[PDB]
Curated annotation (Swiss-Prot):
Protein name: Alpha-like toxin Lqh3
InterPro entries in the cross-refs: LCN-type_CS_alpha_beta_dom, Scorpion_toxin-like, Scorpion_toxin-like_sf, Scorpion_toxinL, Scorpion_toxinL/defensin
Lineage, highest ranks first: Eukaryota, Metazoa, Ecdysozoa, Arthropoda, Chelicerata
Main localization (coarse): secreted
Domain of life: Eukaryota
S-S bonds: C12-C65, C16-C37, C23-C47, C27-C49
Domain notes: Has the structural arrangement of an alpha-helix connected to antiparallel beta-sheets by disulfide bonds (CS-alpha/beta).
Coiled coil: none
One annotated Gene Ontology cellular component of this protein: extracellular region
């Protein structure tokens, strides 16, 4: 499983509300069993997840965010 900063997979980041509430809940439904905030310098403020399955996709850079 992955531990990374969580995004929406299109080379993006999420943004967090400092605490669990928002993207820790998103982390649960995406399937990470702890979720936190983070800052991913290169993008900006991001969320973080631990133990996401291989089918989840997260921050990438090489591109920049598109959706």
């Amino acid at each position: 499983v992955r531990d990374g900063y969580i995004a929406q997979p299109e080379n993006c980041v999420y943004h967090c509300f400092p605490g669990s509430s928002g993207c820790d809940t998103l982390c649960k439904e995406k399937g990470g069993t702890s979720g936190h905030c983070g800052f991913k310098v290169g993008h900006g403020l991001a969320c973080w997840c631990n133990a996401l399955p291989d089918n989840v996709g997260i921050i990438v850079e090489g591109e920049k965010c598109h959706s």
